[PDB]
Amino acid sequence: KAKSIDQATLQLLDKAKQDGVETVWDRKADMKVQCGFGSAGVCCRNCSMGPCRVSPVPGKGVERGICGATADVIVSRNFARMVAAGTAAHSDHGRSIALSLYHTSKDGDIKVKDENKLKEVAKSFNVETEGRDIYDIAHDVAKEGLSNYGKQLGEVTLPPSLPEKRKELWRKLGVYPRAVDREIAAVMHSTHIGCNADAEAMIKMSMRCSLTDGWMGSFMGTEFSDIMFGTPHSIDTEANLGVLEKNSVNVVLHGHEPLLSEMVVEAASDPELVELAKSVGADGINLCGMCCTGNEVSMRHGIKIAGNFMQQELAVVTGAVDGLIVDVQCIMPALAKLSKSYHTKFITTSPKAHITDSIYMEFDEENPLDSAKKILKEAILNFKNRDQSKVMIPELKCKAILGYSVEEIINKLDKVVNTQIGPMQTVKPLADVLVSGVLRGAAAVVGCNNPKVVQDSAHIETIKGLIKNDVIVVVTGCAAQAAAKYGLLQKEAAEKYAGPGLATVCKLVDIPPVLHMGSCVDISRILDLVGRVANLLGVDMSDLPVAGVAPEWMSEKAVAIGTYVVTSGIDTWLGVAPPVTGGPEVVDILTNKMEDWVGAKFFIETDPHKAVEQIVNRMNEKRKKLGI
Amino acid sequence: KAKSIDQATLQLLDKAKQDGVETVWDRKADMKVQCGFGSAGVCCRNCSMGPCRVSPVPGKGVERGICGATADVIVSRNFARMVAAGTAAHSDHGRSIALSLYHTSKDGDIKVKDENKLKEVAKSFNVETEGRDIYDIAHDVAKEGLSNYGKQLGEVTLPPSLPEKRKELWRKLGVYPRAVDREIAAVMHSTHIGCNADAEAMIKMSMRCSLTDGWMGSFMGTEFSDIMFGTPHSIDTEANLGVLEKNSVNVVLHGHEPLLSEMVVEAASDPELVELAKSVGADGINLCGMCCTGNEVSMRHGIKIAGNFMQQELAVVTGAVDGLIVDVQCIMPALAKLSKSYHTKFITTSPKAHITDSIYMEFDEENPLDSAKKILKEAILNFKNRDQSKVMIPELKCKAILGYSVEEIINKLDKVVNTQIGPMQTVKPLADVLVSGVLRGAAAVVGCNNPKVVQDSAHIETIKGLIKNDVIVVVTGCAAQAAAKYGLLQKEAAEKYAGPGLATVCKLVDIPPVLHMGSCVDISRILDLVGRVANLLGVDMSDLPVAGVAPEWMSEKAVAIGTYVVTSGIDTWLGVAPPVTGGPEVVDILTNKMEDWVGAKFFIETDPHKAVEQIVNRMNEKRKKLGI
Ligand code: SF4
Ligand code: SF4
Numbered sequence A, B: 001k002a003k004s005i006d007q008a009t010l011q012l013l014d015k016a017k018q019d020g021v022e023t024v025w026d027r028k029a030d031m032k033v034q035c036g037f038g039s040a041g042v043c044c045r046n047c048s049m050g051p052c053r054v055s056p057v058p059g060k061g062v063e064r065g066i067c068g069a070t071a072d073v074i075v076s077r078n079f080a081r082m083v084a085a086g087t088a089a090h091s092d093h094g095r096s097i098a099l100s101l102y103h104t105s106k107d108g109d110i111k112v113k114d115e116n117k118l119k120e121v122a123k124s125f126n127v128e129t130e131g132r133d134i135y136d137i138a139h140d141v142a143k144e145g146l147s148n149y150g151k152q153l154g155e156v157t158l159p160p161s162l163p164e165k166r167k168e169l170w171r172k173l174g175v176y177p178r179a180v181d182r183e184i185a186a187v188m189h190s191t192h193i194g195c196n197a198d199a200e201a202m203i204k205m206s207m208r209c210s211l212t213d214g215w216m217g218s219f220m221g222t223e224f225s226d227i228m229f230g231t232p233h234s235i236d237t238e239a240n241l242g243v244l245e246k247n248s249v250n251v252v253l254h255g256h257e258p259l260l261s262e263m264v265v266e267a268a269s270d271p272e273l274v275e276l277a278k279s280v281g282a283d284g285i286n287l288c289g290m291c292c293t294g295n296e297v298s299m300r301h302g303i304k305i306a307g308n309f310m311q312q313e314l315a316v317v318t319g320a321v322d323g324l325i326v327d328v329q330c331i332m333p334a335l336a337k338l339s340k341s342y343h344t345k346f347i348t349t350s351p352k353a354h355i356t357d358s359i360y361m362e363f364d365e366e367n368p369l370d371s372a373k374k375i376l377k378e379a380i381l382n383f384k385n386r387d388q389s390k391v392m393i394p395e396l397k398c399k400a401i402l403g404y405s406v407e408e409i410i411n412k413l414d415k416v417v418n419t420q421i422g423p424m425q426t427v428k429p430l431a432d433v434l435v436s437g438v439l440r441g442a443a444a445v446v447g448c449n450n451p452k453v454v455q456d457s458a459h460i461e462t463i464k465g466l467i468k469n470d471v472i473v474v475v476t477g478c479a480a481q482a483a484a485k486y487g488l489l490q491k492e493a494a495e496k497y498a499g500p501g502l503a504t505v506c507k508l509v510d511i512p513p514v515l516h517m518g519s520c521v522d523i524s525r526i527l528d529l530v531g532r533v534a535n536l537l538g539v540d541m542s543d544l545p546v547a548g549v550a551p552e553w554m555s556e557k558a559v560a561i562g563t564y565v566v567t568s569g570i571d572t573w574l575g576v577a578p579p580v581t582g583g584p585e586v587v588d589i590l591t592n593k594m595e596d597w598v599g600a601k602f603f604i605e606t607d608p609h610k611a612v613e614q615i616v617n618r619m620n621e622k623r624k625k626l627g628i
């Protein structure tokens, strides 16, 4: 089968074959037929009595592990641990952001750039703002956010966009969230040998844990990032590997933590570093981003996006990356080995993400700007080691428009508001187009790449089908970057791909049919948007014609995201089967019984066209339930 | 191979074969040859690009996972997740204890029974005590303990017995602990795909996480349990399955959390329940404990111990267990199936541990005594369903002495203190016998059973070898219960098994050669003891001739325990190989490089006699280093 639908990706794969280096595709081929027990989730290693593998087919073979655990128990515990790991990644990101907020000052490297957003957040956290210093408010807000992570007494703080009905449903079901780290610890405790051996209770614990990601960790990370670095607005950028410059220093920012990439962007305008780049024979400094850190700097500053997850290696294969600076998460360790075949300096910066044989330059949060400057200086000085005979940059780049935060979307919707009617600054125009049926619904396309799927194929096919069916699409993460590379993040795309109702809406509001809402933590924005719509219509989020899709997901973070999206009341389609087919009870809970609990459920569909059809049918069913 | 060295265990295995019921031994046999990849730890399932298996033999076969992770990376992440799971179990136990402390009242079900212990703990937590109400002090202490779990700013609180040198070494190494749930979340975050791919850093993160178990979670759980339920003192009890009564109601308490078992013990003396037991035709109520909850109630009240981990099923096989009340952890789910073959009521009580097809009676912490009375009444009423023709109780039980908390040990040591010299109430006599060489050292024997080892064989052989070599032995958990069943927890055992120096010490102090220090969380007591000795000698804990042994461990909790014991500076022998042989770098870190870091290291030895020899040699070389 084809490795990708992206032509630049294919050219660089040919180059990697010529250079004798191996990619993620090569390692996937080397893995050959993957273990059936692990693929079905019926393998357990939770204690040293094991490893235990039970039959994925009930009634045949070994039925129980040594402790007596059934296939359903093993599957449910494995699924819960995936959710806990994803929640941990997102919560650690949000915790770093909250600590950065706590260390803001007027004359420091980290300031408050959006005071209005900070005051609204302070209102949401019961922090007084009138007649107060802005940084005192910021510190109080950071304290409340940090308490959300580890409070042992009392209730956590949740955003006002979350409907009261959803909160009450969670409380009745027993999944109402506690402090984030406490929920992670609870999931890890209940999967220990000889604890929870009941699939339904295990799934409910995992949902409870995922809620602390969706509504607390990711939400606080996003809002505090907006406070410190600015709320995203409509902004132009370029996407795909063609953004690399042969005649300039190329600095590629990979990872998830935004403070480092923000400081690197600021350092790139330093006169001394620009002069140094000129002195090493380069035209200038060309910052490019990848994955979620690329999404953040692109949403807030228009930094060009070099590529998504499965392109990271190919960025090095060009031979033009002088410095690859990585913080945490979704950083293929093979990059270190790959960097030996080129001049590239592979720089790790976080104590959480040491990588063997990489150059470690710890990013100092006490002096973020100076630390970023020294890291960037190492990248710039590496330009002298460039071998221009090994350089091949495909001439394939695509224009994209992004920056669609909830605030930006509301500002855009204000155009189609009659002044004599109003109100202004609400999601009411969006609610109106959804209720009238001009738009059939809204769908979030999120997730990673996965060698099991032709890279970016499922993302593009799902998005095109949805917008052709007058479903407005919001995108995050690597799916958003696939849309950017393909060219869907363009106003022209409305008349090229969208159906009649969505084309009319795009023309009236002057937006692309596909709205890039940011990184994987920025999925919280999607929640926020949906919540607002629900609160405007006086219904729960499970009554709306909305859906989420993860066509090509790979990460534990994706598992946690899908779990909290379903728990919030939004049906979720998974384009890659999770390792649960071995447990019939777990499959039945996730795809059938979940609808009785939270009004939504998982859909597993590896065919994107069938997924689009199912999404449209489900949205029409919910519309008929709602009367619209 | 023999299944056990215990004769009562063998008789009940014959009965289980005659009854056509499966045991843990039968399921282990059914599992046959366990997966080599999982056994070596070279299998990874951390993302849905996998499952990935790399060769346990370097230089052959597949070398890297799909993301590029090496065998060392996969092994180190798997080990770290085991540590995180064990830390989560212990920390959740301690968190429940702290919450119970927070709800103590003068006229409530949960009171303060050891005010002196509470005042000393309050001193350790910087809580004022002079001229204050005892329950105000208790609530402040509980608040400080709870803050240890989830504080995001500042430093955690550690017991005064921990040497300053050990803390400084931890700070220099980068493993100084943070809040417990924060460290669990950090480990889970760094094992996520594309985060940490460096074995040394991964092992250091796991050590940092395990410290929050050893010195914060388990320590606080133990000390708060002492405050609420009484400090253990020397007390007599009986051990092994013979403690069951044919003519009495048999109520078996299995699990770890002590509040429920304490309330059940209190409810058993209720006049209405005793009258009800008489009216259902029984002579009375016979409470028996298993595993750690049995250890707690036995340490504090002399409740008879029915058996350790791999005996739990056999307790039901007797046909005499009218009620089996379980809370969390090390509860084989197969019990639910097994109790169908008998009249036994298998009662789950904790929302953390639901077991399918068991009778769920949620233990209400708000009204603990009434809830315990209701559960106990269900067990008593089940006596009418006893089938006395199916009853077979082995006439095999053994006298044991336990209750050796640090306070009790100090009280015993006061006997050999010359009044004209002093001081009293210190560990000085123990330090003196260790320094003079009358005792060669002290060894902690802890851990579970494991079907991979003849049950209780390794525990007994290791303990007998150590005490024969004039090494005083402290025991916890299932190892302590194996010693109890065998008969080592007896004063007579001193003259039957101990060497000359240990026999003299036992005669002078009037103690058994093997000291039962309580449950698995009570391993913190061992730490406390060692710390005191170190603080009395002005040395670090790694300079002492001390060691820890886990001859037959199975649980993730055991992994976390061994990790924090080694990190504290105490060499640890493992009688069951952990899944790390596939990563040569991880093996080298755990067994060789750890000594450079923390002055102690792991020893993997499956032969108990060889383990005893190695322990004696290591203790002698540490003595020669210390000059004693
Ligand atoms: S999933 Fe289990 S059975 Fe399959 S290779 Fe991995 S450890 Fe072995
Ligand atoms: S927890 Fe149970 S099923 Fe899992 S490895 Fe241990 S004995 Fe086997």
Ligand code: SF4
Pocket (backbone or CB within 6 Å): B044, B045, B046, B047, B048, B049, B050, B051, B052, B064, B065, B066, B067, B068, B069, B074, B192, B193, B194
């Ligand atoms: S994290 Fe890497 S090694 Fe582990 S399953 Fe995913 S791709 Fe394979």
